[model samples]
Target: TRKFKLVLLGESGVGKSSVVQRLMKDAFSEASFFRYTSNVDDDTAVHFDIWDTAGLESLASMYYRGAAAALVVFDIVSADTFEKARYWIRELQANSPETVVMLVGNKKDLESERQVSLADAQQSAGEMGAMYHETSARSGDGVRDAFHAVAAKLIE
Candidate 1:
C-alpha cells in the first residue's frame, strides 16, 4: 500500500465536502475526516490523504505544498467561484509547480443556473496543461472519474 497526498482548494461550499463524501462513500459529520483507500493496481492500493482547507488562504501553503495532486474547484452557478479557481491555479503553478493540478467545476446538478460556460472551463484548464472536469456532488457524477485520472497522473 502507498499513500497519496491530495488536497482540495476551493471557494466556500464549492462541493469540496460533497466530492470528498462522494468518494469516501459516507455522509459528513462534525467530526468527519478520513483516509480513502482505492485499489489502483493489482498488487497495490492507494490511500488518498485528503486535506480540505478551503477559504483559509494562509493555511494553503501547509496544505498544498507537498501534495502530489491538487483539485482547484469552483461552483458552476457562481461566476466568481470560477475566477477563484483560476487564481488558485496560478498560485499552484507558481509555487507547487511539480504538483499536478486539475480544474473541477462543481454543482453541475444546478445546470439550469450555470453561470460559467463549459468552453471557458475547458479553455482555462487546457491553457494551463491541466485536466478539466465537471461534477455533480449531489448526483455523484464525474467525481470518481476526475480523481481516477488524477490517480493515474500521480502514479505515472
Candidate 2:
C-alpha cells in the first residue's frame, strides 16, 4: 500500500485538528482544551498517516520531522491566529525544506465575523508559493477537497 504523511499546524483553538477530523470522519466538535491524539481509517483510496501536532509554539520543532506535506490552518475569525499561521509557515519551510505546504484559512463559515479576507489569505499563500484553501470544519466545506488537492500535489 502507498503511504503518505501529513502534518497539521496552527495555533491552539484555530481548528487545526477539527479540519483533519472533518476530512477524515465527516464530523466536527468543540475544541478540546486538552491535547488529544487519534487516527482514523484511511479510506481515500490513498492511505495517509496524519500527524496532528500541538500548536504550542515550543513543541513545534519536535513534531515537524518527516512531514511530506503540511496543512497550516488559521481561523478567519481570529486575527492573532492568522498572524501565527505565517510563523508556522516559515517554520515548516525552514525545517521541512522538501515538504509541500498548504495555507488553510479555516472557519470560512463565519463570514460575518471573519477578520481575515479571502483576498489577503490568497495573497499570503501566493507570496509563500503554497496552495491556499478556505474551509469550514463545522460544515465540512472545502475539507476533503483541501486534503485531496494537496495529497495529489504531494504525490505528483
Candidate 3:
C-alpha cells in the first residue's frame, strides 16, 4: 500500500479544516473544533493521512516535515487569504521542491461575497505552476474532487 501525507496551508479560518472533514468523513456542521484522522477509499486506491495545521505564521514551518503534497487554501471572499496563498506557493517552491501543490480558492458557494474571481485565481496558479480549484466546504461542493485531484497528482 502507498502512503500519502497531505498538509493544508492557508490563513486562519479559510476553511482548511472544514474541507478536510468534509472530504474525509462526509461530515458538515457549524463547529469550532477539529480532529485528525487517516481515511482511505479503496475503490480509488486513495489513502490520505491529512494534517490540518494551525495557520499562524510562526507554526507554519513546523508542519512542513514529511508532507508529500499541500493544499494551499484561501477564502474566495478574502483578498488577504489570496495574498497569503502567494506566500505559501513561494514557500512550497523553495522548501518542498518535490511536493505536489494545489492552489484552492475556498468558499466558492458564497458567490455574493466572493472577492476572488476564477480567472484571477487560475492566472495566479498558472503563474505559480500549480493546479487550481474552487471549493465550498459548507455545501460539499468540489471538496471531494479537490482532494482527489491532489491525491492523484501526488501519487502519479
> Over the stretch 1-156, how does candidate 3's per-residue lDDT look in tens digits?
666777888898999988977875673332123333232255456566678875465466667666777899999999899999999989988988888889999999999999998899999999999999999998889987887788767656
Decreasing TM-score order of the candidates: 1, 3, 2
RMSD of each: 3.3, 5.1, 3.9
- Looking at model 2, residue 85 earns an lDDT score of 89
**Candidate 1 lDDT by residue in tens digits, 12-117:** 8888988888877732321134587655668655678877763564665777777788898999999899998889898888999888899998999997999999
Per-residue error (Å), model 2, residue 91: 0.5
Clashes of each: 0, 0, 0
lDDT of each prediction vs. the true structure? 0.82, 0.78, 0.80
Assess the local accuracy of residue 106 in candidate 3 as a C-alpha lDDT between 0 and 100.
Answer: 94
Which stretches of candidate 1 lie above 4 Å from their native place?
Answer: 26-33, 41-44
lDDT of 2 by residue, 1-156 (tens): 656667788888899878877775652343122222223325335466778865465466656777677889999999899888899888888888888889998999999999998999899898998899999998999987887787667656
How far out, in Å, is residue 55 in model 2? 4.7
Best by TM-score: 1
TM-score between candidate 1 and the true structure: 0.88
> RMSD of candidate 1 to the true fold?
3.3
